Amino acid sequence: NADVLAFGAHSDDVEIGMGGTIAKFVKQEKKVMICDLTEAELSSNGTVSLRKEEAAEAARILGADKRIQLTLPDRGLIMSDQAIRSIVTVIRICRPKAVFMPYKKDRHPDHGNAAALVEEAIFSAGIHKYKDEKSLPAHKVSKVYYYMINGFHQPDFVIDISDTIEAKKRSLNAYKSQFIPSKDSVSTPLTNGYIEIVEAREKLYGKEAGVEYAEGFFSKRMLMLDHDVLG
Amino acid sequence: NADVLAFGAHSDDVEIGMGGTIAKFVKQEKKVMICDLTEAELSSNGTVSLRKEEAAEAARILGADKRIQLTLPDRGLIMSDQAIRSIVTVIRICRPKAVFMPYKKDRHPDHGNAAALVEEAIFSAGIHKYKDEKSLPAHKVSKVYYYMINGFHQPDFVIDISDTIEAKKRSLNAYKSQFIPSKDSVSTPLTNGYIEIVEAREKLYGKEAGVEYAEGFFSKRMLMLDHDVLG
Amino acid sequence: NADVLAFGAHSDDVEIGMGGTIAKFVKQEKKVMICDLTEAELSSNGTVSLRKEEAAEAARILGADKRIQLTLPDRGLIMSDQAIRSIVTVIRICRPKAVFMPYKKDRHPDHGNAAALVEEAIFSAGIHKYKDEKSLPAHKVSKVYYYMINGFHQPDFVIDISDTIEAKKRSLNAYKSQFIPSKDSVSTPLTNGYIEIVEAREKLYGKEAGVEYAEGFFSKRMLMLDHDVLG
Amino acid sequence: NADVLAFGAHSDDVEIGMGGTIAKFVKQEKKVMICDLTEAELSSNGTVSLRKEEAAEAARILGADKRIQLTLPDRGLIMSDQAIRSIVTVIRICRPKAVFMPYKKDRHPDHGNAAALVEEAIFSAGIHKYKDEKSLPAHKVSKVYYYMINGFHQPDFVIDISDTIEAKKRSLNAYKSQFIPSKDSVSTPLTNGYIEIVEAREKLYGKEAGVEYAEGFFSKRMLMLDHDVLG
Amino acid sequence: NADVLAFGAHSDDVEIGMGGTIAKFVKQEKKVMICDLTEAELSSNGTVSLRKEEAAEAARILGADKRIQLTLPDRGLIMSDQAIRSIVTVIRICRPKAVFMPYKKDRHPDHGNAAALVEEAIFSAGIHKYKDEKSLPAHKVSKVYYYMINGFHQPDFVIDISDTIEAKKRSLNAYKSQFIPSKDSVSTPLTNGYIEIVEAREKLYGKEAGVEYAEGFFSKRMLMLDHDVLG
Amino acid sequence: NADVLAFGAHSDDVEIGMGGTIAKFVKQEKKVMICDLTEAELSSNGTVSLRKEEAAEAARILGADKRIQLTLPDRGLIMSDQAIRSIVTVIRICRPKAVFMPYKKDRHPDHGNAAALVEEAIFSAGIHKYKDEKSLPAHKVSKVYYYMINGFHQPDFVIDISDTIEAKKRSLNAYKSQFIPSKDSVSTPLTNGYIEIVEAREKLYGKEAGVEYAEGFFSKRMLMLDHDVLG
Ligand SMILES: O=C(O)C[C@H](O[C@H]1O[C@H](CO)[C@@H](O)[C@H](O)[C@H]1NC(=O)NO)C(=O)O
Ligand SMILES: O=C(O)C[C@H](O[C@H]1O[C@H](CO)[C@@H](O)[C@H](O)[C@H]1NC(=O)NO)C(=O)O
Ligand SMILES: O=C(O)C[C@H](O[C@H]1O[C@H](CO)[C@@H](O)[C@H](O)[C@H]1NC(=O)NO)C(=O)O
Ligand SMILES: O=C(O)C[C@H](O[C@H]1O[C@H](CO)[C@@H](O)[C@H](O)[C@H]1NC(=O)NO)C(=O)O
Ligand SMILES: O=C(O)C[C@H](O[C@H]1O[C@H](CO)[C@@H](O)[C@H](O)[C@H]1NC(=O)NO)C(=O)O
Ligand SMILES: O=C(O)C[C@H](O[C@H]1O[C@H](CO)[C@@H](O)[C@H](O)[C@H]1NC(=O)NO)C(=O)O
Numbered sequence A, B, C, D, E, F: 001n002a003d004v005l006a007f008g009a010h011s012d013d014v015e016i017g018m019g020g021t022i023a024k025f026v027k028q029e030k031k032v033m034i035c036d037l038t039e040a041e042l043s044s045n046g047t048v049s050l051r052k053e054e055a056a057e058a059a060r061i062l063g064a065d066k067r068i069q070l071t072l073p074d075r076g077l078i079m080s081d082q083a084i085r086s087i088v089t090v091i092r093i094c095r096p097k098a099v100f101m102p103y104k105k106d107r108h109p110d111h112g113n114a115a116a117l118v119e120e121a122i123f124s125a126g127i128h129k130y131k132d133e134k135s136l137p138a139h140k141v142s143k144v145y146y147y148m149i150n151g152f153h154q155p156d157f158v159i160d161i162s163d164t165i166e167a168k169k170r171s172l173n174a175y176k177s178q179f180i181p182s183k184d185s186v187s188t189p190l191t192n193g194y195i196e197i198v199e200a201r202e203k204l205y206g207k208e209a210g211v212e213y214a215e216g217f218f219s220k221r222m223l224m225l226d227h228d229v230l231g
């Protein structure tokens, strides 16, 4: 029974969009699970096996309870029955209260393609007659949120991560192959000051909210507020 | 030091948009103040003096701590320096944490005109060199929300009012002259099943959120969520 | 030559979104046909064979002229050439003046997936060289509209159903397995006061329009008005 | 009891936005009245007295029943109580079923400023206690529409004017001082092929609708359709 | 190394949306390549072989350097890995600075389906580990623009084509089978004054910009302006 | 004949929104003039006379050719005929090719109120019969742009300021009273790391565009591009 299940297309997606929030939730003694849909086998830098090691270290730094690896294809997250079914299994295993996934308004098409698959899976996961690979019972997710990877958009709300910005930056620096040039690295948008740009975005959202750093989220489901109305 | 200050153009505006929420806040031992910008002197039904009595009874039913009467003109809420200054005084007296006002997308122009005046007043209230009628100190409101009177729009969030729907309906029935036909009443949009339409809207928003009844709100200021993310 | 062909993903979709409008059209002596894309085989309550009986009774209550059953998969309305072609056949058989389908902004992904298939089919149906399963001639639909199932959105227009609200409620009550708890029913969003929520929405749209009940529609095609400008 | 009352800021506004529609309505034996808010005294070409003659000829060409001249200031349509009251009088005299006014998304600020005044006047006109200059009874307008002058926007609906495009072009050519260069004319956006641009827009809207020419309109009030759903 | 690569679903798409711009670029001594995704085999008028001849003549009239023919299916531009890969090859062969494709808001679904495939291909083309059919190196497109075929929408920007409107009209008249009725033609939206409607749209966009004719474009990528800020 | 005239409500507005762009234009040997609508007499920090000195130093650092001081009231930028006329005079004196003003989506109401006045003034400035205080001839501004002060919104375009970011930061540091705490300063949103937040925003817009720093702008007038299409 995870409190949170956070999907990314590629390892490092969840950390870029909400690593400060994961670190915050783990410190509140929530159970947080991370699921990567792909092994990022088309990444310009690194290898599949090195990337897995880096992702395991990022998850340990944040205190995530489990890292689940799916093997859908990098640049191949086409809508299909079989891809949805694989994700339904993960949802029904973790029985999360809240699912997070990438926001679709992003230069990388895998981010929106991942969100479309995860939305179909959340619905199918709650239908008892829908059969997954492991024949697991129906599960109804209560909260569904979207985090930003490449975007800088006006979010529906923010979460204060002022106390976990260092844990987020450590989790990102775990992906040395992705963000840090080396003798054999090639130039990508990620190797040219990208962690400083994520920090700049979280500083701007923090300013909107009167704190040092905040992460932005969307919800398509209606938000119901209680303690946070007057705070 | 009010926790909440709720503005309307006319008495009954605040009750239609958020009477369930006021009743909820008062039961949480919050201090709630209501301010009507006008005496509703152009109301097709009733009189100024009868309307004041009805508004005092609605405020008592909800447990609001004080009802403040301004005398800006009904159908005359033109943007002016002097109208903004009158509202700044109310803000600086009550020192509210949260201000509520009408959402502007409404068939009645006074509702959007009231919101425009209250937005200018919230900003001017925080400027120490800005002088109000009573020479009061600067006050910075922390939360600013918009409630719906005539509209049915998709809100930014809802508040569960399932436990205070009866208190809301009692507060509305206090405005007998506005909602209940009599020997000398004239037809208005308010005298033809209007309280049942408010209840229908709050039932539909409750369905979006998985509760019996909820009230809808907007915020232009960024929402920062904490306990309500996972709830 | 049907005047109207109304598509749903599942039987009861068309009734929830526009059963009052179908009943209204049949009373105007229009020929109305209903097509369900799926047999709803993953429905939490009931069976495929019981659901068909209920759908035949709903169609009889509304006076629809024919109910067409397709066998695309429940939770499997992926965009495909073969799924579009199956729908093109139905369009070319019925030669409707107006096609109705679900609005895509809906918690159930099959509703938007159904609309995407029906949009592709309407275009392909008008292309003479496009071959359907029954080798039927090209047909150009004149009007294309979207109805709301789970949503409450601001529509492009409404239709007064004040005189057919009882026929709509009877058509919905025909789906006993879907809406009415029984000894062996499971909880769904449909078994917890859902017909009262549809009635509340149609009451709110009626208020916008000055009538008791109205159903909301969208059009992507430009509306051309004549008698209804001054009415 | 006019069927239609069409407001413009300046004479020629109503003709540019909806002269084909006025000509169509008059041929349907509707009573159409036109009201110009200003005498266009700051017009680069012509004079106040010449402009009035041209406006009287345009109204005669279209068959409008009366042309009402207000004297609010050109480039001075600031929101004021007294400007709203002057317009309320016109509404209460004509008792129109439908009011038309300029759409606000227009390079000329007087067009949106005129619409804002007319919206306030339509509401105040229906309030019996609101007193106009001539102490006239309350009047409730049923339909409220917006036409485009300088814009080319996607409208909410169109009206086929294929049969009245020549009457529209004659009404525009009545404003010789505005559209036709002369020995003493100065260059304006109106003197450089402007009637051909209005014709091009009405040709493009006609294409959207499958007719030769159509005029575009907006409505903020909900549209309720009946005969035009299936047409 | 093309300066420009313009994709259409069907030959004549690029000419309708941006033939004036292609003619303008060729006169500036830019290298312009055109790629048609389909052979338009379901076209109501003409044949595949006649259409190819007409497309070769249109390309010659505009001075395009090469016309590339893909064989994806007319009315079959479903998102697939293999369709994306075919387009990646064209991008990696031409190494364009700028890619143009259809805007998705269009009555013909192939136009949006083509844009979705081309967007996925532009991203995959820049990923070195992504393998195309011809094993070509990664290529990063710098500018990505959308042109309008059937639409008339408010664009993000326009390009003055006043000096190449005649070359555009000649390129369109090359498609005799598509636009000009004959003894054996059937009625389509294209055979009923369609070239005059394209000219009317370019006249309206020219008016917005103060020139005789202009073509409209969208960009999802951020525009960075320098010389055109002050022009 | 200024190339550029940039309006702010308060001195430091233009520098926050576009000081890098002004510095860039001056280095291109454009004539840039700055106009402040108010003397910022309600500023929590500093005095009117100190603020003028700081504004003169900021203008010198950027190389602006003239700084024009109007005396409209701080927190009193109500729409009025006389306020518009004062601004028309400045426009007709400077005869700018391009006018810049604040974007209206901003927590400070004076920023949107200033933009509304400047929009009315740009239109009235081009009307020869409209008389300003100095009886100056009509002037037609060619380009009209909006810059962001407090906002972080997705702009219509950016300008690369990578080479003038230091000049921008020097111009902002000239406003010591506004941004730098002192013995007698009070806390405002401007005294708590605000210049670092402006730099973070310009870093994020630079990332969208592939440069180090960029400033964001809006245009309501249609953009016509030529050299910047292919760049
Ligand atoms: O576009 C990028 O961000 C760089 C690009 O990396 C992104 O795209 C690759 C291809 O789908 C992925 O393998 C890689 O995981 C992805 N990175 C990513 O999304 N980080 O948030 C690269 O490796 O060239
Ligand atoms: O339009 C209506 O809702 C009816 C109308 O009442 C509204 O407008 C009047 C004129 O501004 C106001 O005096 C009256 O308070 C107002 N009612 C109202 O907004 N209730 O929420 C009436 O009395 O005729
Ligand atoms: O989510 C719901 O509305 C309940 C759900 O029913 C909807 O989803 C099922 C799975 O796709 C469908 O078989 C069923 O027809 C559908 N009902 C429906 O859309 N009614 O308008 C259920 O049976 O659990
Ligand atoms: O901007 C224009 O359309 C030209 C301009 O005419 C418009 O603006 C003037 C100043 O408000 C008005 O007197 C004139 O009536 C107005 N014309 C107009 O809106 N036609 O639809 C002019 O005379 O210079
Ligand atoms: O809808 C139309 O524009 C007419 C239609 O032509 C369009 O659709 C056909 C079917 O996909 C295509 O073969 C044909 O190329 C296409 N024309 C087109 O998009 N021109 O811009 C026809 O030939 O009937
Ligand atoms: O809200 C703020 O930015 C602080 C505030 O300063 C802004 O508001 C004051 C009142 O209108 C102005 O005098 C002051 O110029 C203004 N500053 C400003 O907009 N900087 O971009 C203050 O001095 O308290």
Ligand SMILES: [Zn+2]
Residues within 6 Å of the ligand: A009, A010, A013, A108, A110, A111, A149
């Ligand atoms: Zn990724």
Ligand SMILES: [Zn+2]
Residues within 6 Å of the ligand: B009, B010, B013, B108, B110, B111, B149
């Ligand atoms: Zn009210």
Ligand SMILES: [Zn+2]
Residues within 6 Å of the ligand: C009, C010, C013, C108, C110, C111, C149
């Ligand atoms: Zn359904």
Ligand SMILES: [Zn+2]
Residues within 6 Å of the ligand: D009, D010, D013, D108, D110, D111, D149
């Ligand atoms: Zn006008």
Ligand SMILES: [Zn+2]
Residues within 6 Å of the ligand: E009, E010, E013, E108, E110, E111, E149
């Ligand atoms: Zn095409």
Ligand SMILES: [Zn+2]
Residues within 6 Å of the ligand: F009, F010, F013, F108, F110, F111, F149
């Ligand atoms: Zn300012």
